[PDB]
């Protein structure tokens, strides 16, 4: 490394090199920090975590018990050891607490003043962070498996919601219009994700093994259906063009938004070109999931090489996105792992699990 410092200092390399390379080096060194803890507040498993996109200071966390906890990730104490204390919490006594498991929780991109959370009580509630009161409640006729607000839309403020119904609901937070539906799936929608590149592209994955990308502006159905083989097994599309051979319970666009990673219960992950949904044939090997609900996984950002961190049973498996090489499997949870979220500032990973723990993985040295 001192070579890296000397290269930065002399302008041999752009300073971008040392960031990105050092960021990567940090990611490869992720290790369970016992020099950092997250305060236990969930009585039930953590289904979801979300670090705020601006300033990355606060994390939301949704539990199987229905509570939403709001954690502060900055070490405000002077010690080197700290516990990420829980700022607020939608507890059992809140009048608005969810009744059943919170399945997704998301900071409003663009501003930390409002977050949204959806549950198995069939509601997507929008919250004022400051007063911690709901500002809006959308009711759905079927249990919500995931939602997602666009990380990029300065223009629209749609929330895509996937329920057990076969239809994707778009909920407009600007005047509250929960009527719009995308129709074309056939079984529950286990994962939705807006594109980080394009304002109005949404990808939705369903238990029917199909993943569709939609231009929600468009009035004409899906843009693309991802097909495992790219056409080697080609049929008039009524049942073919499955992304997976099981349920597809996870989606994640890569950072720059040029590829889509889907995980499904055939124990595979695939990487897809998000422009024409073609399959890049990245291998990745066998990725165990048997989650019956959405599997929340992330990608890294701002490294030399992009990584994807996928819950693999009771561990987080780290893979290199574009080559498939499994970097490592981070082993520190006790029960299955439900969600991992990446802190892009410091290359830290937080992962929740059914054992009611949120473990921080920070680079060593």
């Amino acid at each position: 490394m001192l070579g890296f410092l000397s290269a930065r200092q002399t302008g041999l390399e752009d300073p971008l090199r040392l960031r990105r390379a050092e960021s990567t080096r940090r990611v490869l060194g992720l290790e369970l920090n016992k020099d950092r803890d997250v305060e236990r507040i969930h009585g039930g498993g953590i289904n979801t975590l979300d670090i705020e996109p601006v300033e990355g200071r606060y994390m939301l966390s949704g539990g199987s018990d229905g509570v939403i906890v709001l954690y502060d990730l900055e070490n405000s104490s002077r010690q080197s050891y700290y516990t990420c204390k829980a700022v607020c919490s939608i507890g059992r006594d809140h009048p608005d607490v969810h009744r059943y498991s919170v399945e997704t929780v998301q900071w409003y991109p663009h501003d930390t003043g409002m977050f949204t959370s959806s549950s198995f009580d069939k509601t997507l509630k929008v919250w004022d962070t400051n007063t911690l009161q709901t500002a809006d409640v959308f009711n759905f006729e079927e249990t919500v498996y995931s939602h997602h607000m666009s990380p990029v839309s300065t223009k629209h403020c749609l929330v895509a919601v996937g329920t057990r119904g076969p239809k994707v609901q778009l909920c407009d937070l600007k005047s509250g219009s929960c009527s719009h539906i995308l129709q074309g799936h056939r079984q529950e929608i286990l994962a939705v994700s807006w594109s980080p590149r394009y304002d109005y592209i949404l990808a939705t994955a369903s238990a029917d093994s199909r993943v569709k990308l939609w231009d929600v502006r468009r009035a004409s159905g899906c843009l693309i259906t991802l097909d495992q083989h790219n056409g080697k097994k080609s049929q008039a599309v009524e049942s073919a063009n499955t992304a997976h051979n099981g349920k597809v319970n996870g989606l994640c666009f890569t950072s720059d938004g040029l590829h889509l990673l889907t995980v499904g219960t055939d124990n595979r992950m695939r990487l897809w070109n998000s422009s024409n949904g073609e399959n890049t044939l990245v291998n990745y090997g066998k990725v165990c999931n048997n989650s019956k609900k959405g599997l929340k996984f992330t990608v890294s950002c701002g490294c030399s090489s992009e990584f994807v961190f996928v819950p693999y049973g009771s561990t987080i498996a780290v893979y290199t996105v574009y080559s498939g090489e499994q970097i490592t499997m981070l082993k520190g949870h006790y029960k299955t792992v439900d969600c991992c979220v990446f802190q892009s500032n410091f290359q830290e990973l937080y992962s929740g699990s059914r054992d009611c723990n949120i473990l921080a993985w920070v680079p060593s040295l």
Binding site: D172, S179, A219
Partner: protein
């Protein structure tokens, strides 16, 4: 010429003949085309809804926007009285288009399917009536239409009429309704019109009734409690917001 966002140039002489509101309309229709969504031209009658369509399609063909090299084959469904009116209108305000009439009167004097094929191949503007749409859903819905304008489109206001289903078999996203009154008795009519132009926006019909028609209606009755008045008010505003982009009602 007049220029809009991506490549839309409408000829200047044509533009100058238009009014300011008709120009706004042409812009709105093109923005929809960009979204690939449909809309309702709900201008009050006599403002000249047809002129705006002429201008917009003319501009689209002239700009040669990029399957289709500009304006593909298109079908106009209008009430039986006004077919030759539309033919006349295309002929004056833009001679270049071929505007075939599909009717017993017509001008073809052969089998009709040959005419359907002819227009779908040479990329004309097939005018027809709601009846011939109901009666040849098979033939007509086999040719990749580019635009599916319905004039006086309120006739599709019954979601179960045969003509409604036939009109909703067309595949292109560029569906347009020109309807001076896109709602006449109840909102079920509105939902039907939106389900032609934009099949998902207002949800399914049951859900639309449940969420919008019942509350909005109950707020009109004399004996309705004020609470229900306010629910109606809320729902009505939500509905307007939902339908704002896709309805241009001057």
């Amino acid at each position: 010429d007049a220029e809009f966002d991506e490549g839309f140039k409408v000829p200047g002489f044509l533009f100058k003949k238009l009014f300011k509101y008709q120009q706004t309309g042409v812009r709105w229709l093109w923005e929809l085309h960009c979204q690939q969504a449909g809309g309702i031209l709900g201008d009050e009658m006599g403002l000249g809804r047809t002129i705006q369509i002429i201008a917009f399609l003319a501009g689209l063909s002239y700009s040669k926007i990029r399957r289709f090299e500009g304006l593909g084959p298109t079908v106009i469904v209008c009430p039986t009285t006004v077919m030759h009116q539309w033919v006349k209108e295309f002929h004056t305000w833009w001679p270049p288009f071929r505007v075939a009439i599909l009717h017993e009167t017509g001008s073809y004097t052969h089998k009709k399917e040959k005419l359907i094929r002819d227009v779908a191949h040479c990329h004309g503007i097939l005018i027809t009536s709601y009846s011939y749409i109901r009666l040849m859903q098979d033939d007509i819905s086999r040719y990749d239409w580019h635009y599916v304008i319905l004039d006086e489109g309120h006739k599709i206001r019954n979601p179960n009429a045969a003509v409604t289903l036939a009109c909703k078999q067309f595949r292109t996203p560029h569906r347009i309704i020109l309807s001076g009154s896109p709602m006449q008795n109840n909102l079920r009519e509105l939902w039907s019109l939106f389900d032609f132009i934009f099949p998902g926006k207002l949800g399914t019909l049951p859900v639309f009734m449940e969420q919008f028609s019942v509350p909005i209606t109950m707020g009109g009755y004399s004996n309705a409690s004020p609470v229900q008045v306010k629910t109606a008010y809320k729902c009505a505003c939500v509905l307007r917001d939902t339908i704002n982009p896709y309805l241009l009602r001057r």
